[PDB]
């Protein structure tokens, strides 16, 4: 009786929100830039190829500096790329080696990863032992790790496949907030320019964002039709990008709280691994399951360019802070670095 | 290069020549995924044998790196993994079609296509004693199983009752049905019949992992 | 704690050898490049030898090439220097330093206590031998350098260093700009092409001391007279 009645009022309510979105859907995105020109044909050569991983990459980040970056790979090893020579930095062996992700912190002395071990491992990379070695482990999930970003180097976000997000305190080692909501596994996150939001895509097709500082979810985003592998906030924090296992790349506006374009074509029919977007965000790129990255015409939704560079699956990218470069890991075990010429 | 950026390459190549000493030792050992139910009773013969709880060990030099975990993202991680060692409890009837559908999922997902699956049949000192008994019977849960007969080629033990191995053949045969539905060769599944107690466990999967290995081998030397 | 202990000096005749023994402990030893550098009495300091990390580099001075002999001992974390044909122009206090070389390190960072031994090329300037101060009060001390030290990957090898009185050296600026770590905010190191400036805002006690500056563009590396700080 209750039961019954409180599940047909959120029918309602789910209907209200789909109306007020459709109210304020005067227009389509693909109307609005109808006008502007292409980008052209986007073309990317390899500048670097970053080798040593022996098994299959799935995650990179840049530092700050965009010089250093961080690659994860599944035969336990962390290495810090000096992306201008090529040299290894560092190579961090990992205590569980099915790594899922890595992040560079913002302040370079800090890194962190976690993968089916439900552990996020942060390791200090400046010592006065000259070593880097693990400052915190931070359990408390109850699935494995999927994604983790640092907020400072006090602050960590980590989204796990227990279906929830955490803000963790890591002096403490104690989650401070657990962001519930999602129905199926986390798959990724995003965090705003000004780390007061972020977004998440879980495997029940759903993207939410997320107040920090609250806890509580602001808005969700629904409208793919399979599992959410990659998200990614615009560069000016009022829209994001996810890739789905369905061969599609939508465009997905917050203050709009509704899908604006869609990016795929008849051609693709594999899944997309990572998404990111280029300092203006006039470039959308992203990594799919047929060993190519594809970029795309943000506001077009246009294929500019292709990035063939690698013999298996395209598992992550990354741009730069300064937008200088591109690099796209792959589970062939390499690392190649991407910009264009004049 | 300056003067540090000589040094810093020489750190930087000292970390290769770390990499290549982990690289040999990774190639060396063989890593299996470890699949089934709570009840499949795995946990035992990777104990007799002796989240992710990775076991080690070596057969004849051999390093085997058997990761017992215990699904359609977290799977991903092993595509690459000499073989997938599938446990199933033939004693329960009543969850075998859980197992078959189970099964099919792993031979028929899509980043296991080229992974050979040593399915593992456990318990069948158990599953002798239900059929002798005939308080249960398999042909309220598999109604052809009425008009199975034993083949000809079957191998019973000595001191095996026949009517054991007319149902002992016959969920194996459930099983290599599924695996000969699909896949064109590209993997294989390898079914034994394994008890908890048994001590040979260690050496079926070291025979199995030869032939999967060797199967590899043949595929480059014949351009398949 | 990181520790650099030297050991083995003493008074030896002319022309004898000895055997130079430095301990380390509270750090990994085999990641960090080790110099030697030795300080005549009453004279500014001297860089000797260095061995990389791994020791695949090995390199002299030249006053030292073909006498001395550098050499490491990872697994004890023990460094040594093996010293041959001792003349009167080696009695000096001999340290023990440690640098480690990727991207953003700060080499030279860790100076041992030293030991005494006793005997019976870019040119680095400090003009300006001592400079009178008062506490509180704004210092700056110059260097200049015979060659730019600006490489053309952008960085400019010159380093900044303090020995207080009875103690060791400690690195202050490395690459002309960065400040060490432990290192007040205070002191700025701010210079161009061949000359270089370090101001030392607010003045204290514990400044007093003499202020080196080193070039680390090249082999070998040569220290700048030094500039004392007195009240």
């Known amino acids: 009786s209750e039961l019954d009645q409180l599940r047909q009022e959120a029918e309602q309510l789910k209907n209200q929100i789909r109306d007020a979105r459709k109210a304020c859907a005067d227009a389509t995105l693909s109307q609005i830039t109808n006008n502007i020109d292409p980008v052209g044909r986007i073309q990317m050569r390899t500048r670097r190829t970053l080798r040593g991983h022996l098994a299959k990459i799935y995650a990179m980040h840049w530092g700050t500096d965009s010089r250093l970056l961080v690659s994860a790979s599944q035969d336990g090893k962390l290495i810090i790329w000096d992306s201008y020579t090529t040299n290894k930095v560092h190579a961090i062996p990992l205590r569980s080696s099915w790594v899922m992700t890595c992040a560079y912190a913002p302040s370079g002395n800090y890194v962190a990863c976690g993968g089916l071990d439900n552990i996020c491992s942060i390791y200090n990379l400046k010592t006065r032992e000259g070593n880097v070695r693990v400052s915190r482990e931070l359990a408390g999930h109850t699935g494995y790790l999927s994604c983790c970003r640092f907020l400072d180097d006090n602050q960590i976000v980590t989204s796990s496949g227990d279906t929830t997000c955490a803000l963790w305190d890591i002096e403490t080692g104690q989650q401070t907030t657990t962001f519930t909501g999602h129905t199926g596994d986390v798959m990724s996150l995003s965090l705003a320019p000004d780390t007061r939001l972020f977004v998440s895509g879980a495997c029940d097709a759903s993207a939410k964002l997320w107040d920090v500082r609250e806890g509580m979810c602001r808005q969700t985003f629904t409208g793919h039709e399979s599992d959410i592998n990659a998200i990614c906030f615009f560069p000016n924090g009022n829209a994001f990008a996810t890739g789905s296992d369905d061969a599609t790349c939508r465009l997905f506006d917050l203050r709009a709280d509704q899908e604006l374009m869609t990016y795929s074509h008849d051609n693709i029919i594999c899944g997309i691994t990572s998404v990111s977007f280029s300092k203006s965000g006039r470039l959308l790129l992203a990594g799919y399951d047929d060993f190519n990255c594809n970029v795309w015409d943000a506001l077009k939704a246009d294929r500019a360019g292709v990035l063939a560079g690698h013999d298996n699956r395209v598992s992550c990218l990354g741009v730069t802070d300064d937008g200088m470069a591109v690099a796209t890991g792959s589970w062939d075990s390499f690392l190649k670095i991407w910009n264009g010429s004049s | 290069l300056s003067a540090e950026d000589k040094a810093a390459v020489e750190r930087s190549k000292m970390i290769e020549k770390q990499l290549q000493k982990d690289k040999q030792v990774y190639r060396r050992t063989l890593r299996l995924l470890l699949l089934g139910a709570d009840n499949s009773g795995k946990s035992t013969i990777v104990k007799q044998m002796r989240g992710i709880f990775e076991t080690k060990f070596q057969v004849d030099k051999v390093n085997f790196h058997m990761f017992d975990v215990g699904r359609r993202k977290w799977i991903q991680c092993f595509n690459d993994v000499t073989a997938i060692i599938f446990v199933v409890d033939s004693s329960d009837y009543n969850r075998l079609q859980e197992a078959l559908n189970d099964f099919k999922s792993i031979w028929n997902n899509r980043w296991l296509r080229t992974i050979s699956v040593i399915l593992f049949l456990n318990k069948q000192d158990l599953l002798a004693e239900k059929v002798l008994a005939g308080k249960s019977k398999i042909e309220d849960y598999f109604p052809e199983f009425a008009r199975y007969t034993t083949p000809e080629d079957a191998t019973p033990e000595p001191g095996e009752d026949p009517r054991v191995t007319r149902a002992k053949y016959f969920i194996r045969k459930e099983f290599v049905d599924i695996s000969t539905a699909s896949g064109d060769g590209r993997h294989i599944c390898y079914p034994h019949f394994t008890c908890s107690v048994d001590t040979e466990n260690a050496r079926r999967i070291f025979n199995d992992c030869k032939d999967i290995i060797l199967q590899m081998n043949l595929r480059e030397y014949n351009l398949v | 704690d990181v520790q650099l202990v030297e050991s083995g000096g003493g008074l030896v005749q002319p022309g004898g050898s000895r055997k130079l023994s430095c301990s380390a402990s509270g750090f990994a030893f085999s990641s960090f490049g080790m110099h030697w550098v030795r300080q005549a009495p009453e004279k500014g300091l001297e860089w000797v030898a260095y061995?990389?990390?791994?020791?695949?580099?090995?390199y002299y001075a030249d006053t030292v090439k073909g006498r001395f002999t550098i050499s490491r001992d990872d697994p004890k974390n023990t460094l040594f220097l093996q010293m041959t044909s001792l003349r009167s122009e080696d009695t000096a206090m001999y340290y023990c330093v440690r640098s480690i070389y990727y991207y953003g390190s700060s080499p030279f960072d860790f100076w041992g206590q030293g030991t005494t031994l006793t005997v019976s090329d870019i040119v680095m300037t400090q003009a300006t031998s001592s400079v009178p101060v008062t506490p509180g009060e704004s210092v700056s001390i110059s260097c200049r350098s015979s060659?730019?030290?600006?490489?053309?990957?952008?960085?400019?090898?010159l380093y900044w260093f303090l020995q207080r009185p009875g103690q060791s050296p400690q690195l202050l600026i490395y690459?002309?700009?960065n400040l060490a770590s432990g290192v007040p905010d205070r002191f700025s190191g701010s210079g161009s092409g061949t000359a270089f400036t370090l101001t030392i805002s607010r003045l204290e006690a514990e400044d007093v001391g003499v202020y080196y500056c080193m070039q680390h563009l090249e082999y070998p590396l040569t220290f700048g007279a030094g500039t004392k700080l007195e009240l």
């Open positions: 690459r002309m700009s």
């Open positions: 060659k730019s030290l600006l490489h053309s990957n952008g960085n400019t090898y």
């Open positions: 061995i990389s990390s791994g020791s695949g580099t090995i």
